[PDB]
Amino acid sequence: LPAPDDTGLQAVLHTALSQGAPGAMVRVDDNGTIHQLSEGVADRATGRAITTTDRFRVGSVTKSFSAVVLLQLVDEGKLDLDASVNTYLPGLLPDDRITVRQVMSHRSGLYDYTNDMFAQTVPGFESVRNKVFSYQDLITLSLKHGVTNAPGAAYSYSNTNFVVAGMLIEKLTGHSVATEYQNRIFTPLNLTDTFYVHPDTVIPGTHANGYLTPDEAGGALVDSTEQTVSWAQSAGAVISSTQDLDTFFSALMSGQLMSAAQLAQMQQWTTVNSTQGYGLGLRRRDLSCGISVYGHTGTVQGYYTYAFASKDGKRSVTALANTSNNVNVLNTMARTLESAFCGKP
Numbered sequence: 001l002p003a004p005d006d007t008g009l010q011a012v013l014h015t016a017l018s019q020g021a022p023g024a025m026v027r028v029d030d031n032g033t034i035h036q037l038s039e040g041v042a043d044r045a046t047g048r049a050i051t052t053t054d055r056f057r058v059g060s061v062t063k064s065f066s067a068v069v070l071l072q073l074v075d076e077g078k079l080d081l082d083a084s085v086n087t088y089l090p091g092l093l094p095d096d097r098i099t100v101r102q103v104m105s106h107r108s109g110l111y112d113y114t115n116d117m118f119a120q121t122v123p124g125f126e127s128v129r130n131k132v133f134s135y136q137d138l139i140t141l142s143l144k145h146g147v148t149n150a151p152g153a154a155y156s157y158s159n160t161n162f163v164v165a166g167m168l169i170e171k172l173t174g175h176s177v178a179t180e181y182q183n184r185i186f187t188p189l190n191l192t193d194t195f196y197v198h199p200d201t202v203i204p205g206t207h208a209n210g211y212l213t214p215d216e217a218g219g220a221l222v223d224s225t226e227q228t229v230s231w232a233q234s235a236g237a238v239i240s241s242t243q244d245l246d247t248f249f250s251a252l253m254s255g256q257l258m259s260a261a262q263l264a265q266m267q268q269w270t271t272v273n274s275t276q277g278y279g280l281g282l283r284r285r286d287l288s289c290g291i292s293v294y295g296h297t298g299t300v301q302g303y304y305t306y307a308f309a310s311k312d313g314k315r316s317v318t319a320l321a322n323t324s325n326n327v328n329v330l331n332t333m334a335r336t337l338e339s340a341f342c343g344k345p
């Protein structure tokens with residue numbers, strides 16, 4: 001690979017701040033050589049600087065953790081990707097033909113319940129932040145709506161799919177998702193900054209605060225740090241750090257978290273758009289220089305995350321801006337992948 005471009009990374013973070021992120025940061029693990037940059041503040045009221053060691057909410061990067069657990073269950077003979085979800089969770093879904101593989105790849109047609117939660121960003125946050133939902137509650141909310149496409153027929157990202165994932169994990173193992181994450185992923189990889197504390201609202205240790213951008217242009221930011229994340233759970237509630245997400249995605253792509261057969265299933269790409277694919281709880285992004293990278297994004301309130309690795313896991317990148325609902329920031333932070341993998345132009 002090209003050398004990572006730290007000048008480029010610096011410019012990306014500075015641009016993100018100019019667009020409304022209180023803080024922005026990035027760490028690159030380049031085959032044993034670290035790159036680390038940060039600009040701005042973890043806490044905009046106190047002025048505490050953000051750093052690459054600050055913990056944060058990784059949001060929908062959680063889907064990759066959920067997928068790893070399910071694929072290990074496939075390896076162990078406990079789960080068949082091509083069986084009906086309703087084979088394992090009887091009467092759960094409106095269509096018995098929706099399969100596990102389809103849920104994990106966002107091809108199920110299940111309506112995304114978050115549609116009905118966060119259309120108004122800040123009011124929706126205030127509605128959910130202190131609620132505790134069961135998995136079934138979230139499924140019921142989705143099923144107030146019809147499916148949006150036939151089983152397997154179309155890609156349509158939906159949190160409902162990874163609510164189903166968590167129910168499958170807990171059903172088939174008899175354990176909580178926290179226990180499964182801890183025993184299958186956090187402990188083996190020594191992810192000392194990584195937690196699943198739902199429904200606790202505290203982020204353990206030193207962390208970036210999250211700032212939700214209101215829907216109204218120019219509106220004051222809302223501190224969204226402390227919430228249950230119960231609306232997401234196995235779709236979005238993991239806490240981590242840049243070092244730990246780098247370790248996780250490197251381990252995944254280098255073959256350490258499941259059999260080769262199941263990693264191949266995880267990397268069967270469903271088209272998202274002309275430069276992106278979705279596997280099983282895994283994203284592919286195709287970068288401008290002809291490099292593809294693999295990982296996931298997160299957008300949980302107040303935190304935009306990119307965590308991606310090269311195909312062999314030898315270079316990994318995690319970037320965080322501590323705002324959300326700000327597409328200028330979101331698009332700018334994607335440029336960290338360009339600078340880190342494509343290097344200087």
Ligand SMILES: *P(=O)(=O)O/[C]=C(\C(=O)[O-])C1=[C][C]=[C][C]=[C]1
Pocket residue numbers: 058059060061157236297298299300
């Ligand atoms: P999650 O709720 O943190 O993130 C949501 C994402 C994502 O994975 O980046 C998303 C993706 C596509 C469409 C809607 C939401």
